[PDB]
Design an enzyme around this catalytic site. Structure first.
Site, PDB file in Angstrom:
ATOM      1  N   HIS A  40       0.913  -1.207   0.041  1.00 46.89           N
ATOM      2  CA  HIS A  40      -0.001  -0.250  -0.025  1.00 46.89           C
ATOM      3  C   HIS A  40       0.724   1.368  -0.053  1.00 46.89           C
ATOM      4  CE1 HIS A  40       0.568   0.197   4.479  1.00 46.89           C
ATOM      5  NE2 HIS A  40       0.372   1.480   4.343  1.00 46.89           N
ATOM      6  N   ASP A  84      -0.071  -7.419   1.685  1.00 50.79           N
ATOM      7  CA  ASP A  84       0.528  -6.135   1.592  1.00 50.79           C
ATOM      8  C   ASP A  84       2.106  -6.284   1.703  1.00 50.79           C
ATOM      9  OD1 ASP A  84       0.387  -3.420   1.721  1.00 50.79           O
ATOM     10  OD2 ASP A  84       0.024  -3.269   3.873  1.00 50.79           O
ATOM     11  N   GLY A 174       3.145   6.107   8.896  1.00 49.62           N
ATOM     12  CA  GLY A 174       4.375   6.591   8.803  1.00 49.62           C
ATOM     13  C   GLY A 174       5.347   5.233   9.257  1.00 49.62           C
ATOM     14  N   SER A 176       4.398   2.349   8.508  1.00 48.16           N
ATOM     15  CA  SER A 176       3.892   1.366   7.493  1.00 48.16           C
ATOM     16  C   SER A 176       4.804   1.044   6.441  1.00 48.16           C
ATOM     17  CB  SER A 176       2.870   2.098   6.648  1.00 48.16           C
ATOM     18  OG  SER A 176       1.980   2.510   7.599  1.00 48.16           O
ATOM     19  N   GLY A 177       5.158  -0.319   6.179  1.00 48.86           N
ATOM     20  CA  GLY A 177       6.135  -0.643   5.356  1.00 48.86           C
ATOM     21  C   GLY A 177       7.422  -0.891   5.934  1.00 48.86           C
TER      22      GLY A 177
END
Ligand SMILES: [Ca+2]
Length: 221
Positions: A40, A84, A174, A176-177
């Site tokens: 995402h 994801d 923030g 995320s990933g």
């Protein structure tokens, strides 16, 4: 990262910041040419920043490298965030050193109760925690039962929960990933959750240990 402590500078050498004008997602270096992040967080092109501690100031250990390829998992779905996970190829190889090192992929799936480290430059929900400096937090993996109980019918085999149902400690937007490392291996990718650090709403992460074949296969390209 909410409820954590500042990571010691460069203590998470695989941690990278995905930058598009500003930091917008985290990622993990898995080899000199590849970074793992969340699907995402996708963008046709992104600048990978390695060797960062304070993302607002140049400290001398940074390496900024533009992406040459951004590949989302073929079965990623934005309607539920299933699968994801994503791979980013660096246009030029990162120069490995004391501040930039890859993190190993899982050699097995970490069971519930395993303690992990999650880090990032996301929301801290704190007036004292310098959000510009990489934040660290230790979170245990929760059982599938706990995960599904928290988010009924929203958990696929490509997701796992980690954190505390009591709340107070969690990753956040923030982050995320970003990485979730346990026993020296990348077990998860920061993905989603209801709010941040809220009781009964633990963090949900992409289950990296079931993507070994896709990751290896894709990195051959
Ligand atoms: Ca910096």
């Amino acid at each position: 990262i909410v409820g954590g402590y500042e990571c010691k500078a460069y203590s998470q050498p695989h941690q990278v910041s995905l930058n598009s004008g500003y930091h917008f997602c985290g990622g993990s270096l898995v080899n000199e040419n590849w970074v793992v992040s969340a699907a995402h967080c996708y963008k046709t092109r992104v600048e990978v920043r390695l060797g960062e501690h304070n993302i607002k100031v140049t400290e001398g250990s940074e390496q900024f490298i533009s992406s040459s390829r951004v590949i989302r998992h073929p079965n990623y779905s934005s309607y539920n965030i299933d699968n994801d996970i994503m791979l980013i190829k660096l246009s030029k190889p990162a120069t490995l050193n004391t501040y930039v090192q890859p993190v190993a992929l899982p050699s097995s799936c970490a069971p519930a109760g395993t303690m992990c480290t999650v880090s990032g430059w996301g929301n801290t929900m704190s007036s004292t925690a310098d959000k510009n400096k990489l934040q660290c937090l230790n979170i245990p993996i929760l059982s599938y039962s706990d995960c599904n109980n928290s988010y009924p019918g929203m958990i696929t085999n490509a997701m796992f929960c980690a954190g505390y149902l009591e709340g107070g400690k969690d990753s956040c937007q923030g982050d995320s990933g970003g990485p979730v490392v346990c026993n020296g291996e990348l077990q998860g990718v920061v993905s989603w959750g209801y709010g941040c650090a809220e009781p009964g709403n633990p963090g949900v992460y992409a289950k990296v240990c079931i993507f070994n074949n896709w990751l290896t296969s894709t990195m051959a390209t």
